[PDB]
Design a protein around this ligand. Structure first.
Ligand SMILES: O=C(c1ccc(C(=O)N2CCC(CCN3CCCC3)CC2)c(Nc2ccc(OCN3CCCC3)cc2)c1)N1CCC(CCN2CCCC2)CC1
Ligand SMILES: [Cl-]
Ligand SMILES: [Mg+2]
Length: 195
């Protein structure tokens, strides 16, 4: 059947609604243990982690595994990285307009495959991002703040109106009360604290 694409680069076509087919490239970060059809992907030029069933999803076409080898790395400062994971943070960034904005978030883990990158989520957007946080730290754009469910089906009641259903796919080791959630008809990875 299919080979193991974790750690590999890919390209594929994508068809949204009745729009045309667009072409994408990305790096496959992980294959979800509790749903091996789901892959976590970082598409080039964007810093969120997206969940796609690359082989089932009929909006995917012309899936091709690239031959690129992602340049590996050993990181710039392990202790800073270690002590940063699991911590609340303030992340400062330049908008499209050029002005500066600052978001509150939480550093989740070291990203797979891409060693100098970190899983992080935010209060204003509780999904899974990834950034080279050690550099934003040294640039002064990041500040640290003072301090079993996997596989289960779940639904999030969001008024007004309807709800979303999905699956819990990952437990964050650094904060075991936090989980990744894949919802149906949405390709972001949601990050919630399930008390
Ligand atoms: O719609 C976008 C889009 C457009 C612009 C930006 C951006 O540059 N952006 C500029 C940089 C970024 C800033 C966020 N950071 C900056 C530092 C801290 C926070 C925001 C958007 C962006 N990036 C981005 C993403 C997701 C996110 O999470 C969703 N949030 C956004 C706000 C509300 C919901 C945030 C940003 C995404 N795409 C592009 C990727 C694509 C992958 C899924 N397909 C499906 C199959 C093949 C590929 C889906 C469609
Ligand atoms: Cl904020
Ligand atoms: Mg603030």
């Amino acid at each position: 059947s299919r080979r193991n694409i974790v750690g590999c680069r890919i390209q594929h076509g994508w068809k949204e609604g009745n729009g045309p087919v667009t072409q994408w490239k990305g790096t496959v970060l992980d294959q979800v243990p509790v749903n091996p059809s789901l892959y976590l992907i970082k598409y080039d030029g964007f810093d969120c982690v997206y969940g796609l069933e690359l082989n089932k999803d009929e909006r995917v076409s012309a899936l091709e595994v690239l031959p690129d080898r992602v340049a590996t790395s050993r990181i710039s400062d392990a202790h800073l990285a270690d002590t940063m994971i699991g911590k609340a943070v303030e992340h400062m960034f330049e908008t499209e307009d050029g002005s500066k904005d600052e978001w509150r978030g939480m550093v989740l883990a070291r990203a797979p495959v891409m060693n100098t990158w970190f899983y992080i989520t935010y209060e204003k957007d509780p999904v899974l991002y990834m950034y080279q946080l050690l550099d934003d730290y040294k640039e002064g754009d990041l500040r640290i703040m003072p301090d079993s469910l996997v596989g289960k089906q779940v639904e999030y009641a969001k008024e007004d109106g309807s709800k979303r259903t999905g699956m819990v796919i990952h437990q964050v080791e650094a904060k075991p009360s936090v989980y990744f959630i894949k919802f149906d008809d949405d390709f972001h990875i949601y990050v919630y604290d399930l008390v």
